[PDB]
Design a protein around this nucleic acid. Structure first.
Ligand SMILES: CC(=O)SCCNC(=O)CCNC(=O)[C@H](O)C(C)(C)COP(=O)(O)OP(=O)(O)OC[C@H]1O[C@@H](n2cnc3c(N)ncnc32)[C@H](O)[C@@H]1OP(=O)(O)O
Ligand SMILES: C[C@H]1O[C@@H](n2cnc3c(N)ncnc32)[C@H](O)[C@@H]1O
Ligand code: MET
Ligand code: SF4
Ligand SMILES: [Mg+2]
Ligand SMILES: [Mg+2]
Ligand SMILES: [Mg+2]
Ligand SMILES: [Mg+2]
Lengths: 307, 538, 682
RNA sequence: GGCCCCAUGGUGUAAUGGUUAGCACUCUGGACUUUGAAUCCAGCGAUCCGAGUUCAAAUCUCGGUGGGACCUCCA
């Protein structure tokens, strides 16, 4: 048996002596959560990222490190310190731990070798708090139409396979459609197992449309109703009835009111619709107040009398 | 008519399910079933198989993780297909004049068109009878049923049942094995080697084959022949550790032969599973405890798996005649439950129990066991007495997940060493100590001085099994809520390659494997030699 | 295609199981191997050859187990890889090229249950490309050298069809054909799958999709699907090949263009045939085989034609054991013996007689001969076990031979008996000419198991046991005089049993040894495989693996011999190989001709003519008469030979002077044949 | 249109103002590496919808909704 006390004592000594290689190997073999590398002393880790990167020096190991990072602190839920004589706490982590870790390590990796560390930078981008799929798709597209210079580069086929490994095909297809770039859409749809004569006419129809109407149509096709109504609003007056129909259908009254200035008559129309909606939900006093605000005085009488 | 009403109810159920999936909310199936059946005026409820058998293709792909039926059928990490041979006579009928005193059925019996030690009313027996004992049809039919339930059949393991398979003519065995491999792969071959090559290049992986055999049919010739077939597991019936019982029941061999066969099989690289039978004649209530204590404490006997089969008396056998004459009486049910609890309390943590009682229909039994859930009754009795069972089956993630509601939290690495059958055995595992939950295991053995295979002579250490439990994850896929494809296998092999070089002192390591496993080990860095996957350690 | 006026040069490509593909060229009677291609440890599962458009450069497409198609082009004098096409994710089971206008199409099927169509065309002239306001799939491009000229070609996917559940086993375009001079080039596709179905596809001109047009097959039952499918010249007929070996043929109606009907096709066993018998009156034959089936063949008579064709009409057994032996008791009743310790007896139902008399062109009243009377109507599979149960299946009158869906179900025969008394699996059965007795034998390794058993045909009980020999009895024969029984065995010996004479009308006669043979007296050095009687019950012939056929004679004079005079009455003949069948024609000629039909392991059938020398020299007793040709012979061992002993027609009333004699043969090459020989020649 | 009665699990049905609704058919899960369907043993699932009177209502008063009995009216 490997008793946890001896292992933890040795690991703490190793971490305090800046010998990340041995600690990493021991934690990997014995299945100890890797977060303890950072949570033991965040300041020292963020001050010596270069030595960490140089000592780990493996794409697979760094990828393993990224697929285990979590916001929670393990020195308070899994491995409490046996001695309570903590020297201090000092600087509270300013932001999301994942964000600082990813940004610092990506900066060091880019400074040391852009070509050797290729899939790990993409993993750092994907694993952040907000998945930046657009940036990684754009980088893959750049790598598609280019020639190598240093015989350590990764082919676009392997990068696409790794991205399909991280994220599902259909989700990538939807994100690419959201990017408003048909090159990326075609790239993803190539390895999608779909009939070309089912989406080629669809993309062609989407192409020959006005820009704002195109964006509204795509957004509606991908839910994203707020962006769809914004894009439709940024168009001609004749489309306003359809915009109002969508506003009423999904109850987007507040966003529409934010979209236009109060002096606009469209603001008055949306206000009247919103007040009628509250009439449907028995909020007589609020909708009457907002009728009085917009100018529907008689409806204010009706609602105020009802309430 | 009720039929169209049923169809409309089903269609409405899938309509609601797919709608809820489209706008992305969770839905409770039972309430929807009851409400929708209320509308159309029915007097029954929908069945899960019917709802599964009407989904459109893309939705069929997407929404199976909610409509699956019988989640136990793939809760151990594989899919099991059982096939049966042609009826035949046991080999020892000639030089003794008769067969074992308690075996029912067979070619010369009143159970028409049934294999030895079976009645024909069993589930698998009725499947092969209507297929007229054809391996291709049986494999196809069983895979179709498993797919209809809603399971994944990426990884398959065969079990060949019947009498003594290795006592049949060579041509029939060739036919059977090549047809099994062809049914998996899809080729149309002429002999074993062609089928093995094509199955190696296949996409529906054949993990291994299991064969049941007698101790006198397990020699160097038979072991080599089974090695060429792709077999990796053996089932032998020991039934007792007492020498007088083995000759008063006309068994036909001796216990020493059993021990020698164990030694040869384990040195060759197989896995051994033993059938044992309590309540045999001339064995009281006190010799059973001693029998099993010796079984699990004596190095000559320690197996890897166990099958407990309490004795049943069936018509048309010698034991039936003994029972009629008022000379044999069975245990009382309370005594039987107590005995089974005591026996299960002794199993070491490296042994797996596959089954606990036979499956003969109740009306055909004259005396003996009458219930049908002996295992859970024994477990409840064990909980009452204060003792606990610690075998392999009742400690893995899937069983602990469906019987109880627990999940691993603090996984650690454990190693156990012992001596068995003249060899030095090690057992490596990844498991959670506090909650007693098993995840993955590996078995390693140092070859003794009496190995006969050419590939294993001169300093070779052999790996006998590697396994990771949970639900089935299809090849090249990943699921973060399951346990398989997360790197527990290359961690278990790196440690096995360190013991074999710094402690055993060997200079080569060999693995016995299937075919998909052949590709896996090729990925790791092993090459092929004979029927083994070998690698230099120097 | 070339303009040097060659002797039709041919290019051949082959792929095998040694992970290699080979190319060959055949210029006249000369062949030579141009190239070999190695795929490592993979395999090639499909091949197709054609030429690039608007040129004469051959191109090759190979489907592999890698779920990936490979394209090769022959520039210079060798084949070089140009392109690799992905998209599939399972094994590929068929590719095919097609030429349409100035473009080339490729159709591909796989075990993914999907069909894909690609398209190869000639790329533009590197100009006139300015419509950048469109969305198009990326093109796969390659360049070739031709007469010091660079030509660029492009490949792009066209469509992805779907609609199958199980594997797709084959796919084929539609061949071009000529109507009144003009060539018509339809666009159609055919697919056959493992889920018992065939689908025909055609494109749609209103949109850019393909639609199913006809879906043919039988969905349901444990029977598996299809392996291959083929078109006709013009598309009127479609054929498909089933899992066991059955053939299905469909024809399209002239007026109704979406209706297809099945038709009559050849059929036969899908494994080795083991035994054969003739109709006592000679209008059908019955065969059994190791495929666990029993089949009946009878001729078809049609008014508006002269030639007669024989077709299967009955399959009166689908058993759970390999069948080994069969014998005939009455005109509609037989006995069968399989790989079990039990003999079985089958009789015929009523609808079979009506169908038989309808197809063969006889009269229903006269075929009954007012002697069958009432009897069951059909048979069906029992709920449990192996048996036949009378359904006293469905009344289905027939005027034409059935198809392979009415034969499988509605054409069984009831079981009316079951005999026990043997300790092991059966090996041989025979019957006498008086229709009241029966013999049997079984596999044995000692003397107490190898024993002949005699039965009765009116009340089936054992009559007497004849214990002799120590090994299996291979064949037995009743002399036409109904006063002898002979046996030959694996122990290189034989024995003759004579029936003693009693009047005792209520009793039954008995048999006892009349002659025998030990190790020394035996002349065959190895296993004896066959024996037969002379038509006058005088001599008998034996054939063994010693490549020799011997005549033992003077078995007549049953009145009173001292003990016997049985011995070799001829000279041994070295045929050339092991003999596994012997038969003697049941026709007597004044010149005393005894013709013997000898079969061998290699499927040869030799007719000799044996003549008794009547002199102390034994030369001029073996004469070679005729031998089968290389296309008329078999390919594996011959297991039976049986002349047409038309005892019902004792003298041929309506015959052309009996110019011809007929007989039949079967063997382990899945084949049953009927041969005819000129009478006056022999 | 008034005129008497009926309504509890998906279906057939039990129970008296208490201090928390029982059985059958159907359905789901385990013994089970010999089994969706068989055996044994566990489990999920209801007093239509409103007002209410009595300390307290599935239970008694009055309602709407459907149904059953009488003639409808009506065209
Ligand atoms: C050799 C024998 O006796 S049998 C092995 C046990 N049999 C079984 O398949 C039952 C369960 N087995 C398993 O859990 C796995 O198949 C094992 C034991 C072989 C490996 O366990 P894991 O921890 O899942 O392996 P690990 O996560 O280290 O490796 C994952 C990789 O193996 C691949 N892999 C897994 N099984 C196979 C296989 N049969 N053939 C080929 N590749 C395979 C996965 O596709 C994955 O590759 P990728 O993600 O790079 O594309
Ligand atoms: C197939 C296995 O069944 C067991 N077996 C055989 N006969 C009986 C019986 N009467 N009762 C219980 N188990 C039996 C033996 O252990 C055999 O190996
Ligand atoms: C099917 S019984 C178990 C296998 C073998 N007949 C034995 O007795 O060992
Ligand atoms: S060897 Fe096994 S199968 Fe054969 S008779 Fe004995 S117990 Fe039955
Ligand atoms: Mg009700
Ligand atoms: Mg009631
Ligand atoms: Mg009540
Ligand atoms: Mg059940």
């Amino acid at each position: 048996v490997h008793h946890r006390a001896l292992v933890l004592a040795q690991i703490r000594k190793w971490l305090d002596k800046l010998m990340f290689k041995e600690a990493f190997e021991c934690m990997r073999k014995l299945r100890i959560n890797l977060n303890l590398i950072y949570d033991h002393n965040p300041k020292v880790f963020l001050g010596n990222v270069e030595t960490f990167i140089k000592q780990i020096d493996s794409v697979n190991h760094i990828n393993l490190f990224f697929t285990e990072l979590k916001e929670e602190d393990v020195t308070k839920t899994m491995y409490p310190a046996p001695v309570t004589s903590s020297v201090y706490l000092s600087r509270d982590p300013d932001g999301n731990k994942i964000d600082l870790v990813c940004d610092a390590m990506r900066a060091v990796m880019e400074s040391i070798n852009p070509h050797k560390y290729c899939l790990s930078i993409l993993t750092s981008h994907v694993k952040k708090t907000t998945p930046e799929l657009e940036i990684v798709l754009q980088k893959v597209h750049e790598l598609q139409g280019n020639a190598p210079s240093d015989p350590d580069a990764v082919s676009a086929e392997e990068a696409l396979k790794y991205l399909l490994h991280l994220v599902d095909v259909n989700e990538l297809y939807d994100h690419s459609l959201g990017t408003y770039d048909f090159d990326l859409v075609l790239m993803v749809a190539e390895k999608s197992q779909k009939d070309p004569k089912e989406y080629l006419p669809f993309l062609n129809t989407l192409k020959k449309m006005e820009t704002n109407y195109q964006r509204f149509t795509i957004d509606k096709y991908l839910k994203r109703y707020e962006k769809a109504i914004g894009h439709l609003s940024k168009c001609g007056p004749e489309y306003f009835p359809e915009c109002l129909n969508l506003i009423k259908d999904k109850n987007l009254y507040n966003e529409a009111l934010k979209l236009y200035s109060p002096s606009s008559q469209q603001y008055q129309d949306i206000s009247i619709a919103y007040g009628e909606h509250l009439m449907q939900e028995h909020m007589y006093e609020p909708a009457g107040l907002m009728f009085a605000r917009c100018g529907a005085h008689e409806k204010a009488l009706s609602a105020f009398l009802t309430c | 008519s009720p039929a169209e009403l049923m169809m409309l109810t089903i269609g409405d159920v899938i309509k609601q399910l797919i709608e809820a999936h489209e706008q992305g909310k969770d839905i409770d199936l039972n309430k929807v079933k009851t409400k929708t059946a209320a509308k159309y005026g029915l007097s029954a409820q929908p069945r899960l198989v019917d709802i599964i058998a009407a989904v459109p293709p893309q939705y069929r792909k997407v929404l199976m993780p909610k409509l699956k039926a019988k989640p136990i059928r793939t809760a151990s990490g594989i899919a099991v297909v059982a096939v049966m041979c042609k009826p035949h006579r046991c080999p020892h009928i000639s030089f003794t004049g008769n067969i074992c005193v308690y075996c029912p059925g067979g070619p010369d019996s009143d159970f028409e068109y049934s294999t030895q030690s079976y009645t024909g009313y069993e589930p698998t027996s009725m499947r092969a009878i209507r297929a007229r004992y054809d391996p291709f049809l049986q494999t196809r039919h069983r895979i179709e049923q498993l797919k209809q339930l809603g399971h994944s059949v990426d990884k398959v393991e065969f079990i060949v049942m019947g009498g003594t398979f290795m006592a049949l003519p060579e041509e029939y065995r060739d036919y059977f094995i090549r047809n099994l491999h062809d049914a998996l792969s899809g080729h149309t071959s002429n002999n074993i080697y062609e089928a093995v090559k094509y199955s190696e290049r296949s996409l529906t992986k054949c993990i291994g084959i299991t064969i049941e055999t007698r101790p006198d049919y397990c020699m160097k010739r038979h072991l080599s022949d089974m090695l060429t077939y792709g077999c990796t597991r053996l089932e032998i019936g020991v039934q007792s550790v007492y020498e007088d019982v083995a000759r008063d029941t006309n068994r036909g061999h001796t216990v020493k032969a059993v021990c020698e066969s164990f030694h040869l099989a384990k040195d060759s690289g197989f896995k051994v599973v033993a059938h044992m039978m309590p309540d045999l004649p001339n064995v009281g209530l006190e010799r059973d405890i001693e029998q099993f204590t010796e079984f699990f404490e004596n190095p000559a006997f320690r197996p890897d798996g166990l099958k407990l089969y309490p004795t049943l008396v069936i018509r048309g056998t010698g034991l039936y005649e003994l029972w009629k004459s008022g000379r044999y009486k069975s245990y009382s049910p309370s005594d039987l439950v107590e005995l089974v609890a005591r026996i299960l309390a002794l199993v070491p943590p490296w042994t797996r129990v596959y089954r606990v009682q036979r499956d003969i229909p109740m009306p055909l039994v004259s005396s003996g066991v009458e219930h049908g859930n002996l295992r859970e009754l024994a477990l409840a009795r064990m909980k009452d007495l204060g003792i606990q069972c610690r075998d392999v089956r009742t400690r893995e993630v899937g069983i602990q997940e469906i019987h109880h509601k627990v999940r691993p939290y603090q996984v650690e690495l454990v190693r156990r060493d012992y001596v068995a059958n003249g060899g030095w055995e090690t057992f490596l595992s990844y498991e959670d100590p506090d909650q007693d939950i098993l995840i993955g295991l590996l078995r390693l053995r140092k070859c003794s001085e009496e190995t006969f295979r050419f590939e294993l002579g001169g300093g070779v250490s052999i790996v006998r099994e590697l396994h990771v439990y949970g639900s089935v994850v299809p090849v090249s896929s990943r699921d973060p809520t399951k346990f398989q494809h997360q790197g527990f296998g290359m961690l278990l092999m790196e440690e096995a390659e360190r013991i074999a070089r710094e402690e055993h002192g060997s200079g080569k390591i060999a693995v016995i494997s299937g075919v998909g496993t052949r590709n896996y080990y090729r990925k790791i860095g092993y090459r092929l030699q004979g029927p083994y996957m070998v690698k230099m350690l120097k | 295609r070339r303009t040097s006026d060659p002797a039709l040069c041919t290019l051949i490509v082959s792929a095998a199981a040694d992970s290699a593909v080979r190319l060959w060229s055949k210029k006249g009677p000369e062949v030579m191997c141009l190239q070999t291609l190695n795929f490592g440890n993979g395999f090639a599962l499909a091949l197709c050859l054609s030429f690039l458009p608007n040129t004469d450069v051959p191109i090759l497409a190979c489907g592999n187990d890698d779920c990936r198609i490979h394209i090769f082009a022959q520039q210079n004098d060798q084949f070089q890889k140009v392109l690799s096409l992905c998209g599939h994710e399972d094994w590929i089971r068929g590719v095919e090229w097609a030429a349409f206008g100035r473009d080339l199409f490729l159709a591909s099927c796989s075990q993914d249950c999907l069909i894909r169509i690609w398209k190869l065309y000639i790329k533009s002239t590197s100009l006139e490309t300015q419509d950048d306001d469109n969305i198009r799939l990326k093109e796969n491009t390659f360049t070739i050298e031709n007469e010091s000229v660079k030509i660029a070609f492009a490949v792009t996917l066209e469509t992805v069809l779907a609609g199958h559940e199980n594997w797709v086993n084959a796919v084929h375009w539609q061949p071009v054909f000529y109507k009144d001079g003009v060539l018509q080039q339809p666009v159609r596709l055919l697919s056959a799958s493992m889920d018992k179905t065939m689908i025909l596809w055609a494109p749609d001109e209103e949109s850019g999709v393909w639609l199913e047009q006809v879906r043919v097959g039988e969905v349901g039952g444990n029977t598996l699907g299809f392996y291959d499918c083929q078109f006709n010249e013009d598309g009127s007929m479609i054929i498909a090949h089933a899992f066991h070996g059955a053939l299905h043929l469909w024809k399209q109606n002239t007026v109704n263009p979406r209706e297809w009907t099945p038709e009559i096709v050849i059929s036969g066993h899908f494994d080795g045939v083991q035994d054969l018998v003739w109709d006592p009156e000679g209008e059908f034959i019955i065969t059994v085989g190791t495929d666990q089936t029993t089949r009946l063949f009878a001729p078809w008579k049609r008014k508006d034609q002269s030639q007669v064709t024989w077709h299967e009409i009955a399959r009166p057994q689908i058993h759970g054991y390999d069948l080994k032996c069969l014998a005939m008791i009455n005109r509609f009743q037989f006995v069968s013996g399989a790989d079990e310790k039990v003999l079985r007896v089958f009789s015929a139902p009523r609808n079979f007689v009506e169908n038989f008399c309808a197809i063969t062109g006889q009269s229903l009243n006269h075929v009954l001969c007012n002697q069958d009377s009432d009897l069951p109507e059909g048979a069906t599979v029992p709920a449990l076990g192996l048996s036949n149960k009378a359904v006293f299946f469905q009344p289905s009158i027939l005027t034409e031979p059935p198809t392979e869906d009415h034969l499988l179900q509605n054409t069984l025969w009831p079981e009316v008996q079951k005999l026990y008394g043997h300790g092991y699996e059966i090996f041989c059965v025979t019957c006498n000419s008086s229709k009241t007795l029966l013999a049997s034998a079984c596999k044995a390794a000692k003397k107490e198991h190898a024993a002949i058993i005699l039965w009765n045909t009116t009340s089936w009980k054992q009559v007497q046991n004849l214990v002799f020999h120590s090994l299996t009895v291979t064949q037995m024969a009743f002399s036409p005089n109904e006063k002898f029984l002979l046996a030959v065995s694996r122990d290189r010996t034989w024995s003759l049993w004579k029936k003693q004479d009693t009047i005792s009308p209520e009793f039954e006669p008995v048999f006892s040894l009349f002659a025998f043979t030990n190790k020394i007296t035996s002349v065959h050095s190895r296993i004896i495989w066959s024996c037969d009687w002379s038509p006058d019950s005088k001599y008998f012939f034996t054939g063994s693996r010693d490549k020799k056929v011997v005549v033992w004679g003077e078995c007549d004079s049953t009145d009173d011999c001292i003990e016997h005079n049985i011995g070799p009455c001829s000279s041994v003949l070295d045929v050339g190989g092991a003999v596994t069948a012997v038969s003697v024609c049941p026709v007597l000629h004044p010149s005393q001709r005894y013709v013997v039909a000898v079969g061998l392991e290699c499927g040869k059938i030799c007719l000799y003519t044996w003549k008794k020398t009547d002199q102390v020299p034994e030369i001029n007793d073996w004469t070679h008469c005729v031998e089968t040709s290389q296309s008329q012979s078999h390919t594996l061992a011959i297991r039976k030979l049986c002349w047409k002993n038309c005892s019902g027609k004792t003298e041929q009333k309506e015959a052309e002077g009996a110019e011809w004699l007929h007989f039949a043969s079967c063997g382990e090459d899945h084949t049953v044949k009927i041969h005819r020989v000129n009478k006056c020649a022999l």
